[PDB]
Design an enzyme around this catalytic site. Sequence first.
Site, PDB file in Angstrom:
ATOM      1  N   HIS A   7       0.836  -1.207   0.000  1.00 44.14           N
ATOM      2  CA  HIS A   7       0.000   0.000   0.000  1.00 44.14           C
ATOM      3  C   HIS A   7       0.859   1.240   0.000  1.00 44.14           C
ATOM      4  CE1 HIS A   7      -3.781  -2.019   0.126  1.00 44.14           C
ATOM      5  NE2 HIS A   7      -3.597  -2.600   1.285  1.00 44.14           N
ATOM      6  N   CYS A  15      -0.195  -0.081  -4.340  1.00 44.10           N
ATOM      7  CA  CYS A  15      -1.649  -0.097  -4.355  1.00 44.10           C
ATOM      8  C   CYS A  15      -2.112   1.228  -3.789  1.00 44.10           C
ATOM      9  CB  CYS A  15      -2.120  -1.290  -3.534  1.00 44.10           C
ATOM     10  SG  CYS A  15      -3.909  -1.530  -3.587  1.00 44.10           S
TER      11      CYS A  15
END
Lengths: 365, 369
Positions: free
Chosen positions: A79, A128
């Site tokens: 992330h 992400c």
Amino acid sequence: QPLAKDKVALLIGNMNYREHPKLKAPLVDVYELTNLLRQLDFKVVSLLDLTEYEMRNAVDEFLLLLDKGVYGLLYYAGHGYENFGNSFMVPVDAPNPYRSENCLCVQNILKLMQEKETGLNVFLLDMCRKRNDYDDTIPILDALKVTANIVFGYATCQGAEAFEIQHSGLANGIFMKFLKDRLLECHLTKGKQALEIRSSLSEKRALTDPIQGTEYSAESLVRNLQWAKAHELPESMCLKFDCGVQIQLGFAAEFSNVMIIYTSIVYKPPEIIMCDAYVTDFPLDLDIDPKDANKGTPEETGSYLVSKDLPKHCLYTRLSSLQKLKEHLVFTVCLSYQYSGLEDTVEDKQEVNVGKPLIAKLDMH
Amino acid sequence: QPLAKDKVALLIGNMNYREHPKLKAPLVDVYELTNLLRQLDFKVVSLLDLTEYEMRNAVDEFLLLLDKGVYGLLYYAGHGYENFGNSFMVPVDAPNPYRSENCLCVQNILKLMQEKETGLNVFLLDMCRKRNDYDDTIPILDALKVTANIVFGYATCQGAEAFEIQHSGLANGIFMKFLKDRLLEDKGKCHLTKGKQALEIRSSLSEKRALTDPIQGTEYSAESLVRNLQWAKAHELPESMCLKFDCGVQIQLGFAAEFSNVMIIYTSIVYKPPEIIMCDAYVTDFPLDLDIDPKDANKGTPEETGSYLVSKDLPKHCLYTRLSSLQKLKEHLVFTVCLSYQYSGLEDTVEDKQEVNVGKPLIAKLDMH
Ligand SMILES: CC1(C)CN(C(=O)Nc2cnc(-n3nccn3)c(Cl)c2)c2cnc3cc(Cl)nn3c21
Ligand SMILES: CC1(C)CN(C(=O)Nc2cnc(-n3nccn3)c(Cl)c2)c2cnc3cc(Cl)nn3c21
Ligand SMILES: [Ca+2]
Ligand SMILES: [Ca+2]
Ligand SMILES: [Ca+2]
Ligand SMILES: [Ca+2]
Ligand SMILES: [Ca+2]
Ligand SMILES: [Ca+2]
Ligand SMILES: [Ca+2]
Ligand SMILES: [Ca+2]
Ligand SMILES: [Ca+2]
Ligand SMILES: [Ca+2]
Ligand SMILES: [Ca+2]
């Protein structure tokens, strides 16, 4: 001639988020990229599932290796977020929502890399994003992307679904393809994606450039041994139990913070007809579910290592999180054995200590 | 399965800048991508060396083809620049310094594409940026609000030298490589070089799309009709001909399309009668619209004319002439084929000449002047 003084790499893959959607993709992509970089003469560190504290220690020690002429590669998968031009790598312990102080900033690492006097900096982010985290409208206010040799790569997918979709498959990661195509010498899926590559090179640099190799260098020995001693694996044990049974305990590295253990019976006396060995009792820091221990393939543990990579016909256990080890990796090989001619099953226990394997050696928790 | 209702492409390659450093790279990259797209069932236009007027007409007419469900690809290579969040494609006639009024804005074209009910837009820019364009304005934007079914690709190198170096080689275009890897379902070589470089690829797709998706040949019959006709009207090449000179000598006169605005002409003697001992043939008298130097006509390879086409691609043993700039042809392409011949037994070289008219070949047939 472009030469490297050294070739050093740090790869991070974050997956096991506490407060955020878990990812799967990083594991494969780190492994395959490690395997590439080894063949280009890089010393690699490969870390899965790092906290903020872990990430900072890892990145700083990478940055400390970037002397004059060094070729340095940093890779992150997991992330990330973006705010006002500033991008952030999110550790697995980060709360929801993202705050900057819980995260490592890309642009800071990039600025640090540009001060170091390297022969090549490579910084590759495979992030992400949250669905609605598009790039912000900004002026550019500060840059160093001229004064030192830089390749900066930034892939994005909007949302975990599109991220995992685009990363599906083996052998197929965007940056591995980029490196192979651009720095030596997978269909476009649904959703929103972006890639940015930026480079500033005063002369042609490639990952395949020779290291300036040394016969008698103290510094080069230092560099080699600092890395190599962070990658000591336990020697295989033939554990002799009092009944005469011999269990082989074997060890494999998967990442700098992941070890496979595997068990096999190598001697069964004639007084034993049946035996089973298993491992249990691992340090709580490493956090093993015994449901994911003792499996009949390494595949079942979640390993990248397949049945053809490791010794065959064992039980396999994956010990991840080695960076969290406080003391020694003390665990127990148990033996169940049945005596020849009897129904009677005996249990036995053998405590094993294997020290601090791999990055656990550093003791940096 | 995704379907296209059509496949249309426009490729522009700008090189011959009047007021700016000339480029070389675009020629090859346009040709090779044109070839790829041809094989994927695109109707392609490929134009070299366009003015602002020419670029605008071309781009506008491209935009007209983007009906519902059409797959459209626009490609540009040449100079670009950036200004306050906008990016610009520079036509070959652009004044120095660059002013927005003289150039085509990327963001305009992108939103003009995204307004269509297309099934896939592809917009690829492969640009040289002059070094002076790095230092003069604070950057803001280049990303864009990439929405619909769109693939936006945007590449830059700082300065013509670095641009040319990064493009050195055949087969080695970043976007061709990209499309082949990422956008074909299947149903080293480009080493990173010195300088300051950037690549940006952005995609938004509501469902998987590929350039290989089959054409749906149902619905919208008049739109289909017009698309097909308009394109094919821009690609009529003249047939190969044999000119018989009154002395009996036969000159073959052949034609090849290199781009939608470039034609190769080639001449050869295909019969010499026994009464002639030696002969040679050449072309002259081309319309001044096309500009072409006669020292660059009549060459002994197509390579010598400046073509992509090598001696493998055309008939061997000819003289080759390259006619670029066909979009500037205001009238007919009228030229003269000359023959020089010596009779056996004579010291005399006789001359003869035949005029040829081939009409308006290729994009010239649009008649835009
Ligand atoms: C082997 C060294 C020199 C060390 N290093 C690390 O990542 N160190 C590290 C330190 N602390 C933790 N930690 N765990 C718990 C708490 N703090 C962690 Cl995770 C890692 C890297 C990192 N990259 C490269 C590349 C090449 Cl070559 N050596 N090298 C090294
Ligand atoms: C064939 C058409 C329909 C037309 N077109 C053009 O580019 N038109 C064009 C018009 N004017 C000039 N000009 N020259 C002098 C002055 N004005 C020029 Cl250069 C070009 C494109 C452009 N792209 C694609 C794609 C597919 Cl399919 N058809 N298609 C077409
Ligand atoms: Ca944002
Ligand atoms: Ca900033
Ligand atoms: Ca903190
Ligand atoms: Ca993958
Ligand atoms: Ca300790
Ligand atoms: Ca018992
Ligand atoms: Ca229309
Ligand atoms: Ca104008
Ligand atoms: Ca500018
Ligand atoms: Ca090329
Ligand atoms: Ca005469």
